[PDB]
Amino acid sequence: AGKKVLIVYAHQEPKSFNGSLKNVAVDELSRQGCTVTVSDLYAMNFEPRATDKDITGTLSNPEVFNYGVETHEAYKQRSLASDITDEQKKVREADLVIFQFPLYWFSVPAILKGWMDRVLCQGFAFDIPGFYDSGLLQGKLALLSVTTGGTAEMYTKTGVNGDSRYFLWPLQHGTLHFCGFKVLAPQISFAPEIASEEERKGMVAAWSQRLQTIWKEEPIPCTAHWHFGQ
Amino acid sequence: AGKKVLIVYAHQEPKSFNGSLKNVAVDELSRQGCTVTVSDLYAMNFEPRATDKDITGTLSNPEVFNYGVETHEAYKQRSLASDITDEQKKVREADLVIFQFPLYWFSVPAILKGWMDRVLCQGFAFDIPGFYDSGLLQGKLALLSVTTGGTAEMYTKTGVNGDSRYFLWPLQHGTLHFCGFKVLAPQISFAPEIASEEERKGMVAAWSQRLQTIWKEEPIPCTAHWHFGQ
Ligand SMILES: Cc1cc2nc3c(=O)[nH]c(=O)nc-3n(C[C@H](O)[C@H](O)[C@H](O)COP(=O)(O)OP(=O)(O)OC[C@H]3O[C@@H](n4cnc5c(N)ncnc54)[C@H](O)[C@@H]3O)c2cc1C
Ligand SMILES: Cc1cc2nc3c(=O)[nH]c(=O)nc-3n(C[C@H](O)[C@H](O)[C@H](O)COP(=O)(O)OP(=O)(O)OC[C@H]3O[C@@H](n4cnc5c(N)ncnc54)[C@H](O)[C@@H]3O)c2cc1C
Ligand SMILES: NC(=O)c1cc(N2CC2)c([N+](=O)[O-])cc1[N+](=O)[O-]
Numbered sequence: 001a002g003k004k005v006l007i008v009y010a011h012q013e014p015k016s017f018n019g020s021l022k023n024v025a026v027d028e029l030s031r032q033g034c035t036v037t038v039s040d041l042y043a044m045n046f047e048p049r050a051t052d053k054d055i056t057g058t059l060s061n062p063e064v065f066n067y068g069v070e071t072h073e074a075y076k077q078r079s080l081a082s083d084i085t086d087e088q089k090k091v092r093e094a095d096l097v098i099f100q101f102p103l104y105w106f107s108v109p110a111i112l113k114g115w116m117d118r119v120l121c122q123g124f125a126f127d128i129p130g131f132y133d134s135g136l137l138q139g140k141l142a143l144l145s146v147t148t149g150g151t152a153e154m155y156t157k158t159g160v161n162g163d164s165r166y167f168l169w170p171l172q173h174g175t176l177h178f179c180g181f182k183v184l185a186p187q188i189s190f191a192p193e194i195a196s197e198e199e200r201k202g203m204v205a206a207w208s209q210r211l212q213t214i215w216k217e218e219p220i221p222c223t224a225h226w227h228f229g230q
Numbered sequence: 231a232g233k234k235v236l237i238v239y240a241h242q243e244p245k246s247f248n249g250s251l252k253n254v255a256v257d258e259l260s261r262q263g264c265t266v267t268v269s270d271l272y273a274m275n276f277e278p279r280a281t282d283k284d285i286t287g288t289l290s291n292p293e294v295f296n297y298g299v300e301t302h303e304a305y306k307q308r309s310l311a312s313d314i315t316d317e318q319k320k321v322r323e324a325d326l327v328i329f330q331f332p333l334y335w336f337s338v339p340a341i342l343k344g345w346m347d348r349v350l351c352q353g354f355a356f357d358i359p360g361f362y363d364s365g366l367l368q369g370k371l372a373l374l375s376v377t378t379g380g381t382a383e384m385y386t387k388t389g390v391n392g393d394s395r396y397f398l399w400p401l402q403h404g405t406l407h408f409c410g411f412k413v414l415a416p417q418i419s420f421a422p423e424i425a426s427e428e429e430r431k432g433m434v435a436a437w438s439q440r441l442q443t444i445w446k447e448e449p450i451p452c453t454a455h456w457h458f459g460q
């Protein structure tokens with residue numbers, strides 16, 4: 001039996017360092033025999049805004065619009081917009097979701113935030129109850145592959161930015177773990193715009209090399225202690 | 231004399247609890263004689279995606295698009311899209327910026343993420359050097375007014391979600407502090423949807439009351455210790 005991978009990719013420029021890391025992931029996972037799909041959010045002009053257009057059916061309560069409630073129900077009625085349900089198919093079938101993005105404001109670019117907000121709806125990714133370790137995507141793996149402007153030392157506890165692990169918490173725990181994913185350790189490629197040609201090559205090579213044995217890695221313990229120390 | 235307030239507001243439904251919190255803020259700050267402006271993102275259909283459309287006319291390097299470089303240059307050359315510069319004008323003039331939003335995945339809704347992404351460009355909100363306490367918005371105050379689905383107990387260190395301060399980091403430190411704002415203590419309105427109508431009313435009264443003395447408040451210390459201590 002093989003493995004299915006979805007790469008959710010958020011960068012405007014094919015020739016960027018992010019583009020290189022995404023292409024390398026496709027090549028290496030494809031070479032392994034994996035089933036691979038890429039959602040290139042900017043080329044898709046993916047809609048990030050959570051709005052009433054996300055539901056192609058009778059809006060249940062059209063007097064007071066509640067996005068959570070309307071999308072939950074629309075999920076059950078199979079009446080979500082097709083951009084959403086197309087992504088949900090991709091996610092439903094994946095054994096591994098990789099997110100490839102440059103860090104914007106200690107988080108994901110908005111187009112990618114919008115993918116999280118609209119795709120990962122109640123009924124689909126979680127239920128109440130049915131989250132964290134009972135999240136509806138248990139059994140899947142997830143991996144953040146992030147590039148920064150800041151260097152590694154800036155992202156240490158004694159540095160100006162604090163530990164890079166600090167900003168991971170809403171993504172790794174708040175989102176991914178919440179939906180039931182097991183989380184592989186993040187790939188962080190620090191400061192590529194500042195690095196030499198060779199350092200950049202080494203970072204891209206370190207990532208393809210990691211992907212070779214990706215199916216053998218254990219998930220991190222996705223806890224407050226992993227992220228915060230103490 | 232006076233002060234000016236910008237409320238950056240991210241909720242699709244005026245009749246929502248978020249809508250009431252926004253309306254009470256406008257009411258009360260207004261009554262005080264403040265100048266008040268609301269950027270109602272969803273009603274503006276505000277563009278969240280960071281794209282080459284954000285630069286007017288001809289790019290500095292159209293072969294390889296770098297969003298950061300291009301927006302930094304367009305800022306100096308006064309060629310940023312008018313939707314961005316319209317917001318920058320509001321922020322420039324503000325003494326206090328209030329963010330009013332529902333928590334979406336331990337962060338801001340994507341439409342508001344894209345506000346941050348596209349509005350707070352280099353040259354305007356920060357430079358290098360010129361960030362953290364030297365950020366270019368220094369002397370300004372910022373405050374997150376956030377509503378949750380989860381209860382206050384869920385957002386303790388021993389609750390399922392972890393302390394609320396953990397998720398504030400990318401916003402308060404990574405973004406607001408980084409641009410030089412001083413950050414007032416967040417206003418967190420826990421689980422309104424679950425509350426009685428009377429409880430909801432009490433939380434709107436509490437927000438109004440706090441705003442009566444907002445100008446008397448001191449900033450939090452925006453450190454890793456505040457967020458992850460103790
Ligand atoms: C809105 C905004 C907010 C930001 N917020 C933050 C923040 O909170 N924290 C932070 O740390 N940073 C922040 N940044 C910076 C951003 O994270 C970095 O600029 C980004 O991660 C760099 O990735 P890139 O793919 O765009 O690099 P690129 O600019 O594309 O370039 C890296 C270099 O490597 C070259 N390259 C491409 N492919 C290869 C390859 N295969 N082999 C060798 N070289 C290659 C490229 O041509 C280029 O010269 C922010 C930037 C923006 C625009
Ligand atoms: C995509 C997505 C991701 C989410 N992620 C998270 C997460 O990470 N963590 C989390 O905790 N939550 C999360 N949530 C939940 C979200 O934070 C809450 O649903 C939201 O904060 C509730 O605020 P509201 O304004 O929308 O409530 P409302 O639905 O508007 O409900 C409150 C009630 O108050 C009523 N009301 C309005 N004004 C008044 C007034 N003046 N007096 C009395 N009653 C009034 C309204 O009629 C309504 O019935 C997420 C939701 C979505 C859709
Ligand atoms: N590496 C950095 O010094 C850096 C660079 C940028 N810049 C160039 C886009 C941003 N940022 O925009 O938020 C933030 C940081 N930071 O470390 O927090």
Ligand SMILES: NC(=O)c1cc(N2CC2)c([N+](=O)[O-])cc1[N+](=O)[O-]
Nearest residue numbers: 068122178335378379380381384391
């Ligand atoms: N009150 C909650 O239990 C709750 C509800 C939602 N809901 C309404 C969509 C989300 N969330 O979306 O991630 C998160 C939580 N949470 O505590 O982490």
Ligand SMILES: [Zn+2]
Nearest residue numbers: 173177222223
């Ligand atoms: Zn976790």
Ligand SMILES: [Zn+2]
Nearest residue numbers: 403407452453
């Ligand atoms: Zn800080």
